[PDB]
């Protein structure tokens with residue numbers, strides 16, 4: 159173990175839960191892993207992959223992101239801050255992608271999932287961009303049950319970091335779609351208490367948070383530190399009891415520990 163890993167272990171031990179971290183430094187492609195090959199429930203962080211999959215579809219349909227998608231009252235689930243304003247109306251796939259990523263709208267996420275033919279279509283996109291680990295099995299809201307030992311709707315920190323890098327910094331998407339994904343992630347509204355809180359204020363972050371049962375507290379981020387090449391950082395966290403409170407400070411602490419290395 160490295161010093162960063164021993165610090166992450168100490169944070170995890172005092173946290174009362176299970177922490178997973180994966181950093182990729184694209185300055186030199188090095189990786190820091192803590193429980194990097196253990197599965198964690200993704201919860202809302204799976205939305206990135208659904209949005210990227212729709213962006214990928216849009217590479218061969220110029221007008222796909224402008225296509226209207228009907229929002230019915232029955233479509234509303236547990237957290238719909240944008241979709242509820244369009245009930246009995248429509249949202250475009252661009253609007254749904256932005257709502258899913260920036261406001262973590264679960265109705266928008268379900269519309270993205272349906273646009274891909276269900277959770278298996280998101281998993282298939284993951285496979286098509288080289289992610290052998292990601293699996294999406296359910297829609298919102300049950301994909302957030304986050305039951306320990308349940309492999310459904312999970313990934314590992316390493317695989318998620320690798321995928322987020324390919325999507326945001328690599329060529330898993332076309333150039334325009336990559337820029338759109340990064341623009342969406344950087345305009346996230348929900349991230350300031352998570353990885354963002356553990357990094358120097360001068361660094362630009364685009365991220366996607368998630369949370370679920372068992373106190374599951376997740377964040378996945380692409381980071382532009384001042385004067386250095388970007389990083390990819392994945393912090394997953396989950397706890398032993400179903401009603402545990404969210405612990406975004408633990409993600410911030412892990413990010414702060416990561417930041418002290420590179």
Ligand SMILES: *C(=O)N1C[C@H](NOS(=O)(=O)O)CC[C@H]1C(N)=O
Pocket residue numbers: 200201202203236237261262263264298299302348366367368369370
């Ligand atoms: C995603 O994990 N979810 C949607 C909603 N927003 O996520 S955030 O809090 O990480 O921004 C929170 C609840 C969760 C869900 N159970 O749908």
